[PDB]
């Protein structure tokens, strides 16, 4: 199975009970501290060790992140290694995010330019990527040499190429057809 | 330390240890407050094991305590086992009280090693005609009788019990391995009346009980004959079917994580054979004559787990599903049942003469049955007229009545020696019998016999 | 990385977020979370035993198979559609029990005991164990006391005796039910008991039978235990062994019981479908590997007990009385084909079989019996003393008669010996045949055994052997009544009444 | 509440509700843009049903908006649906309106109970002589066509249609399920034609179809045949092809997640015809008399789909390639077909005795094939050769011209009764036609008819 698949349940109850106790941004920064926290490869290391049981690698998580976590997350840290579930803590993480974007309606765009782009240009196309879209919007800018013009604009699975990259692409494909 | 029980496939129980305290490879397992004891096949990883029970698995849960008794399952040994009924784990099922034992051992052991082998070439009457005469027996030797459902195989196990272990100086283990309660009962019985019941130990495993049982009973009869090889002695075995050590293997396999081969078998089941069978053998201590009969499923000899049994033993008698068939008992095929003592510098010249013509005059006449079943007797040659007339009184002349078969027959048994085998097969090969019918010949015994019946059609 | 376990679904881990503690659900309570096929898997239900009822909301059951380290796997014994996921589950504390009683005989039941014929309630005093371990080896007693089966070819050739186990096996619609229906109907003055469990049929050919029975005076010594097409599979799979418990009530009490089992092969097919559904790894033809298990824990169970086994369990009630439970299983092989896998393990467990064949029911055989592939194991010690005094080795006989008669089909001339045997053989086979619902005594048919082996019938030509069979069991009935309920009264065979059986028969022959 | 689609894998569509608001198992659900209907199989947990789409999946994407009936799918039942063609869904498919109906019915129920059952052996002659002598029907009993491709199946099933229909006065309900869209056209304008539509009602869920339908479409033909017999009236239902709603089983097995049983069917094949056969049967409020034509795959009968068939009918017959490529119609095995009114405590003794004797005299021809082929009949003997040439007149006489084979051959069909079929098998079982020769009792109707064609 893919690992979206295995890590919907626990995202989807780790949003279920911060929408109800309303803690949100908590269970957020513990999960990205948690992500980061498992990516590192020292506790990487030592979460594939064969001799140490699963309540002591919870024990040995829930000691290097500390403070960063409240008791319910403690429980959750718990529940997830008791099922062996420790490697799908990046991807939880991020299906976590994707539910809170969608609760507080919002939408994370990456637009990519050829030149730079000033701050009246950002707030442009975040309005008419937010009349579109029927979300706030958060633009993230970025660099490109192979670009000669235009804009491209990626939000989930759509984009718009307004780029002069995928002009000559279609008018390559016109005329050779 | 203790574990617990986390799992209950079927027969298949999964228990989880602390990870300094897991269970070694056949390490027996008490289960707490239930009369169960289960057996460790596999470990699985992170302390936990898979087992097997020897017992039922109705009052089992989940979260149940479970010792380790540190050893593998050690049953009695000794002469306090003779005339006592055991199981598998080897508390008695008589109603005789506890077993006066002084030594127990592991039923989990090496096979013996090469420089310990020992073969002898003493031959070994029976009193049956065609086993006589196509199959000889080898002191301390291994005999397999083959066979589908209903041709004979316990009727022939109990006429080379009662022509063999009755009048045996020594000692005797049967082995019932995934059969009828009804047998084992009427065996039981039979060796109370017949006085003969001091000199044989029972174990019995039936075909009701969970297939741990049915998967190490084999084990358990076979180390309580290994002790009597070992202290010295000439022992009897005999067991009643060796193919159900194989089925229960079977029903367990894919439980236990493996992948099927060929013809839905375990993966493992030459392997499981040879260690079985390996143990079974004579050494330079002493001599275990076995007699182990072989169930044929479906009547298929090319049946992968026959066809693995034919090379572990020295004499191979086959019997026929045709034959029996035919009405015709013993019902041993004389074309397809070979022995390793069938060799003229064992037996004679004269017996390997007579036997070799035997088997010439019925494989020709194999050859010509189709050809008279379509167009007729007449339509032969003079030769093929003598040759078919002289191996229908053959084929008659192989049947014989049995002492344990008057309950099937209505007649009596009859005992032959080998030297009236001998000189009545080669008085009907050198035409002597060519002016009696072929009818004279059927279930009579002893060469005049049939000279007797000839006079009363 | 493996797939997704029945309690990874966020109700549970939330759950476990609230409080880590397992004391959140009590120990023999637990809630559904899948529901398919008949196959409900539960999460919780932590002190359940293998076998143990299950409790759901409706009145509907269901019972443990599966116990996985996260979940439990359950099937239901009813309908399952109503279950839903959500509801709550509990433990009984019990194991599947019925009805047991002399008060079920005349009654049509379901696989659990409720009444189906509209008849009113079962007053049964009694409740018992549907899943049983068979008794030991030290408490079983020789099988040596008759059961009749009404038929010449079964009584003679292939005898049943009390806690004998006898397999009818062959091809479809030819005549198994019909052997095992009338082996029911003439237990009717013989004091055992019947049960008859039908096993995958349709409901209008298991009401066919039961008026079949009422017809001949026999329904009200037979229980019927039904699991018809459209019930659930685990109703299916459960029905012969509460049929075998219920016959086992008058086993441990020291009468003696039939059971007719008409399709253990619709029970494989049934337990083949529960435990695919289960996901347990299959063997040939998609079969479990532990299929002979369930047919040798059932057919183990009938069985001859001892008179101590009887006082043990009576307490000293029931003395110097043994008990018996005689078993009839039946299998439908497909076009001849035993090398199936069901097959070849209930020959395998059975005290003997009979064999029946498409080609002598088209040939006006009509009881089918080949008795070259049919056998008992028991023989002539399940039988009287005249039966087994004028049966002994007419089956071997008859199948060297099959060898001959194919060997000498174009033969121009043979020997006197060759032409009496074929004689007698044509005759014997010609006696074999018998009409459905025709049941003979024991002085009936050893009068016909009287006239086929004493050489009476050599005179008497094919097409008149039937006509001399009934025509000589008139003329004793007019004339010999003494005598037929002589031997009538236990099978009995001296000098005296061998010479007034010859008398009758030359008399019969004589002035006939 | 409303749910939304998760995965399509052709037709099996799983759909996510709210978790106090999950469908249970047979509910119907619509999807709200395209009006597909949805049936709901299991329960997979976590909100989710996993379903079999009625109709095309070509076109859904992931994201749609499913709305839950709150019940079964219904179908109009009563006297509105006579006349008239409808689909799985209950909707007409003849360009005729709307069925004006008072009530619907699901088409899920159980079968009716032990006590419930009715007993019968009143004989229904249906004109064909291999049929009324060798397996013959009950009124309110059930029959089974056994045959391979191309047998004769459907030709047999409309010719006793066109027979029964003489004596019979209440209503008909016919199921097409999974044949040919041109055969039900042919037998609509045929009833059409001859003014008999307005007792037959009409189902059809056939080979063009999405499995879903011909899964279901069996269903909702039996339910009318249901309400008709729960009326108490007398009704027949015809259903071409059952193996159809079978192998629609076999089609969305993998899909649903089940382990393959033996030769790659469905596991709750036994299960899944259980529950569908037995609500064909006749109850004490009223009778249903059935005709079904049973496929058998690549001409095997052992195959596991006719051989759990078997055992769900009362009277069984099997047809044969080898006997139709002797040219012999309507092609019956007479040693296969069996039935459970051929007991002399029915039919009496003379029918009993004539079909006997007719079986033994073609078992005794069947086992001498071999050594006809390789020597000839010849080297047979006196009674063997009298019983090949009697087995060969009985051959050739079990053939009959029909009234629906009229276009094939331009014969005329034959009615033949019951009485003239046992006093003609009789007489040539007795010898009183062995100066005949064998092809004049061929393809004709009664024994006096091969008297005429013998002298020709
Ligand atoms: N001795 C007999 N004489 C005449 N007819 C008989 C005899 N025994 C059975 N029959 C007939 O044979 C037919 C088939 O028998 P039966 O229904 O018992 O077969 P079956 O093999 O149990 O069938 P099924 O496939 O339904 O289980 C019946 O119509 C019955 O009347
Ligand atoms: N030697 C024999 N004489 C007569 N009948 C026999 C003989 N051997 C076997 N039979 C018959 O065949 C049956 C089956 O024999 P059995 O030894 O039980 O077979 P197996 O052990 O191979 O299954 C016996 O119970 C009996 O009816
Ligand atoms: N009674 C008959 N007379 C003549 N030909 C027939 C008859 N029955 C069938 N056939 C021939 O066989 C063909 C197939 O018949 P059909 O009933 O469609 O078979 P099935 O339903 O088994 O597929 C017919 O189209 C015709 O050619
Ligand atoms: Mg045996
Ligand atoms: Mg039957
Ligand atoms: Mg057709």
Redesign the pocket.
Known sequence: AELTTLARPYAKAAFEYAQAHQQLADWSAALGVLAAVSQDDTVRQLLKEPQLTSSAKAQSLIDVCGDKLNAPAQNFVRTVAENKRLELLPTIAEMYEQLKAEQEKSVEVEVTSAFTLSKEQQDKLAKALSARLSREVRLHASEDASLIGGVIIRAGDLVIDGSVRGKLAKLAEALKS | SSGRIVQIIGAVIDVEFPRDAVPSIYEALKVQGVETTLEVQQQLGDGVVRSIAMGSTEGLKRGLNVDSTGAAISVPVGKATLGRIMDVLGNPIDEAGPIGEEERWGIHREAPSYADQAGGNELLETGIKVIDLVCPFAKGGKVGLF?????????????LIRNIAIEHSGYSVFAGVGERTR?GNDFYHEMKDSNVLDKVALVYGQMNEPPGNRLRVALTGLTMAEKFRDEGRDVLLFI?NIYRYTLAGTEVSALLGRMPSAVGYQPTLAEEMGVLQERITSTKKGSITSIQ?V?VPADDLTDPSPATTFAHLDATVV?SRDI?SLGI???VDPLDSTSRQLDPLVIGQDHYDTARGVQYVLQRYKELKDIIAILGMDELSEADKLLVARARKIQRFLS???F??EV??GSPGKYVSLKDTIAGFKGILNGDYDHLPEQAFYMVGGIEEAVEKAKKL | MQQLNPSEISEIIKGRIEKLDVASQARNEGTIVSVSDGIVRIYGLADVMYGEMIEFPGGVYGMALNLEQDSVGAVVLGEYQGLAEGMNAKCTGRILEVPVGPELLGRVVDALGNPIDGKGPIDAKATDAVEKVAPGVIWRKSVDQPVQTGYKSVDAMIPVGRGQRELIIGDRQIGKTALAVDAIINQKDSGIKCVYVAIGQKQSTIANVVRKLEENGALANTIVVAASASESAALQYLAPYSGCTMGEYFRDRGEDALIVYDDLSKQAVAYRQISLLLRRPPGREAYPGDVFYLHSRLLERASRVSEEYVEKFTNGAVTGKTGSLTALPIIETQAGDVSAFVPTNVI?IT??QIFLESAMFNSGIRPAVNAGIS?????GAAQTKIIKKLSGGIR?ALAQYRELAAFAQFASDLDEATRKQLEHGQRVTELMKQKQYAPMSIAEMSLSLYAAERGFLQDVEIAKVGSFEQALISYFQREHAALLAKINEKGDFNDEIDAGIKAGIEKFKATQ
């Open positions: 066979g589908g459902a209903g041709v004979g195989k316990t009727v022939n196990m109990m006429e047998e009643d009969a169930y019997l029996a008992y013993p019902a014989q009545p049995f344990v078969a099937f027959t | 395998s005290d003997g056998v008992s194991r028991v023989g071997t």
